[PDB]
Amino acid sequence: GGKHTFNNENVSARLGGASIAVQAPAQPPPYSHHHHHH
Amino acid sequence: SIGTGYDLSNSVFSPDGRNFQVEYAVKAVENGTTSIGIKCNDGVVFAVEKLITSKLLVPQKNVKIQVVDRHIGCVYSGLIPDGRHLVNRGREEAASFKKLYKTPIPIPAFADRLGQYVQAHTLYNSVRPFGVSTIFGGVDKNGAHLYMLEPSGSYWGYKGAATGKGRQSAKAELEKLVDHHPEGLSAREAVKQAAKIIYLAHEDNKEKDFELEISWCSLSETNGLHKFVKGDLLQEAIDFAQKEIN
């Protein structure tokens, strides 16, 4: 009744994103006004 | 903006031994009018582009030169008040050099009582430096003098000076003269030879009209004091100048 094949391949890309990280050192100011400047 | 941390304050040093707030003040002088001073065989002549923003301003009485005690002058290019704050220290201490020594203050000893003061602002933290670069010279016992003041605290002795936005230009026409005339200009051609320059230095601002000002100090024509100009002397110098460039 049917002679064709299908050949289900992985022609599609894909991805899994949980790029979870730790540090975040971005920007500590301990001199918000330099604390008497002097 | 090499350092986003080392600019919020003064009295710091970058990793490259620099302090950048001085290196940003200097960019406030550049956004200022032009001002020069020529050295001569007897004295000096100063000058300036005095811009006019409207038609409504009175002529010849929004002057910009400030005259210190009769024998030295100071002209600005930058932020004016920090300037006028500065002569108004130079106009008082020189007295305090007189009432102890009785001589009019010389020119160098007037500098080190400025060039040492300005340097004080660029080492504390609770202050701001000056956004000026003022020229000053005059006459004394041992000849003429002429100097530049610069917000880093430096000053050096110049035959010719120019600041503002017309720096790169007037640093040429003052190189030409010092090749033609090593023997010292007289004090009645330098003047008109100054007017030639400010009319050439304007052309960064060909938009807007303006006004020209001069002040001049030399022994022969004045007997050794500071003074403005008036009359045929500057009017011809105007007539001299815009002639040659048309």
UniProtKB/Swiss-Prot annotation, chain B:
Gene Ontology terms for molecular function: mRNA binding
Family: Belongs to the peptidase T1A family.
Keyword Cytoplasm: yes
PROSITE patterns: PROTEASOME_ALPHA_1 (PS00388), PROTEASOME_ALPHA_2 (PS51475)
Role this protein plays: The proteasome degrades poly-ubiquitinated proteins in the cytoplasm and in the nucleus. It is essential for the regulated turnover of proteins and for the removal of misfolded proteins. The proteasome is a multicatalytic proteinase complex that is characterized by its ability to cleave peptides with Arg, Phe, Tyr, Leu, and Glu adjacent to the leaving group at neutral or slightly basic pH. It has an ATP-dependent proteolytic activity.
Extra facts: Present with 12000 molecules/cell in log phase SD medium.
Subunit details: The 26S proteasome consists of a 20S proteasome core and two 19S regulatory subunits. The 20S proteasome core is composed of 28 subunits that are arranged in four stacked rings, resulting in a barrel-shaped structure. The two end rings are each formed by seven alpha subunits, and the two central rings are each formed by seven beta subunits. The catalytic chamber with the active sites is on the inside of the barrel.
Residues making up the signal peptide according to the UniProt record: none
Gene Ontology BP annotations: proteasomal ubiquitin-independent protein catabolic process; proteasome-mediated ubiquitin-dependent protein catabolic process
Keywords: Acetylation, Cytoplasm, Nucleus, Proteasome
Localization terms from the record: Cytoplasm; Nucleus
Database matches in Pfam families: Proteasome, Proteasome_A_N
Superkingdom per UniProt: Eukaryota
Gene Ontology terms: cellular component: nucleus; proteasome complex; proteasome core complex, alpha-subunit complex; proteasome storage granule
InterPro entries in UniProt: Ntn_hydrolases_N, Proteasome_alpha, Proteasome_alpha-type, Proteasome_asu_N, Proteasome_sua/b
Protein name stated in the entry: Probable proteasome subunit alpha type-7
Modification after translation (UniProt): The alpha and beta forms are probably products of the same gene with different post-translational modifications.
